[PDB]
UniProtKB/Swiss-Prot annotation:
Organism (species): Homo sapiens (Human)
Residues annotated to bind Zn(2+): C228, H234, C300, C302
Name of the protein in question: Lysine-specific demethylase 4D
Entire protein: shown range: 11 to 341 of 523
Modified residues (PolyADP-ribosyl glutamic acid): E16, E17
GO BP term, pick one: double-strand break repair via homologous recombination
Length: 331
């Protein structure tokens, strides 16, 4: 068995190997990369996502989200308070202000210490989930707006044509902006490209040990667990590495820098934080190996998780028994 300790693997494809996206994912899996839940892909030195980032300031962040925490430093939830619209140029200036900027630090490990110690005492503002793309249309390799769609994968594997579309999303972050512990919708893959700015630190639990993380979360968030049998689908709960180590949960960590891709694998729980002003682009995707994970994915039916149009068909075809109850949650 390849990669039996489930370590995060890092890949350095040549320009030739960067042509065929599906083939390279399958290669990474042949080496055991999925066992970690997360992999890093450093693009060939010849590749670029676009020529410059000099003209992005007029993108609108229609609904910036202030991430307000409750709990203790290592075990907390966050809620998202909607703020007034602002442009990317306005948000970058805000991120760089004395109130929100990254503090002085020695290295990534010192910054990580400061994040876990102090996150809860501040409320950073995240421009998340903004439909669009920063890939130049002429970038032909690993262009997250030109991937094969999940609907076409389901049709190729299972023969059933379904409605729905699959487009990328932009994330504009600042110091302390936080992504809570989750897997993807329908336990899909995700791919995330850090276009510019400061790093993003990731934590991940191997897919084979995901249920250990779920059992800890039910113990640590006991009211949320009674409210919903899949409450991590709400994407609000944080648990620190120190707490995970104290409770024997297997995980790994890695820092992504500008110019790098990360891939999350089906049922790979992940969480993390931004180091400073940055912009990332991400999208879900599928491969043939996903189909069995899609069929087994948990679902929130309490009404909190509220998701895309396109998830309807995935539930309806892969999980017909759950469909009725899940759709009640969506309506
Ligand atoms: O970058 C973020 O805030 C969150 N991204 C992801 O969870 C991802 O790409 O799957
Ligand atoms: Mg612009
Ligand atoms: Ni994710
Ligand atoms: Zn729920």
């Amino acid at each position: 068995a390849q990669n039996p300790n489930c370590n995060i693997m890092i890949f350095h494809p040549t320009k030739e190997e960067f042509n065929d996206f599906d083939k390279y994912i399958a290669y990474m899996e042949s080496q055991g990369a999925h066992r970690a839940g997360l992999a890093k892909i450093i693009p060939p030195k010849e590749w670029k996502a676009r020529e410059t980032y000099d003209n992005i300031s007029e993108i609108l962040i229609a609904t910036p989200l202030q991430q307000v925490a409750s709990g203790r430093a290592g075990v907390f939830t966050q809620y998202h308070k909607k703020k007034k619209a602002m442009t990317v140029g306005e948000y970058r200036h805000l991120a760089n202000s004395k109130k929100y900027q990254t503090p002085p630090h020695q290295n990534f490990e010192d910054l990580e210490r400061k994040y876990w110690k102090n996150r809860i005492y501040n409320s950073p503002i995240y421009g998340a989930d903004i439909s669009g793309s920063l890939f130049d249309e002429n970038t032909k390799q690993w262009n997250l707006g030109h991937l094969g769609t999940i609907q076409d994968l389901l049709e190729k594997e299972c023969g059933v044509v379904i409605e729905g579309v699959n487009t990328p999303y932009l994330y504009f972050g600042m110091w302390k902006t936080t992504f809570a512990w989750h897997t993807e919708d329908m336990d899909l893959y995700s791919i995330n490209y850090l276009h510019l700015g400061e790093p993003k630190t990731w934590y991940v639990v191997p897919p084979e040990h995901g249920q250990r993380l779920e059992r800890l979360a039910r113990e640590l968030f006991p009211g949320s667990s009674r409210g919903c049998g899949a409450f991590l689908r709400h994407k609000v709960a944080l648990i620190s590495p120190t707490v995970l180590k104290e409770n024997g949960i297997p995980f790994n960590r890695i820092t992504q820098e500008a110019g790098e891709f990360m891939v999350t694998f089906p049922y790979g729980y992940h969480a993390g934080f931004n180091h400073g002003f940055n912009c990332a682009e991400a999208i879900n995707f599928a491969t043939p190996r996903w189909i069995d994970y899609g069929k087994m994915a948990s679902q929130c039916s309490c009404g909190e998780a509220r998701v895309t149009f396109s998830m309807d068909a995935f539930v309806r075809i892969l999980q017909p028994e759950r469909y009725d109850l899940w759709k009640r949650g969506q309506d």
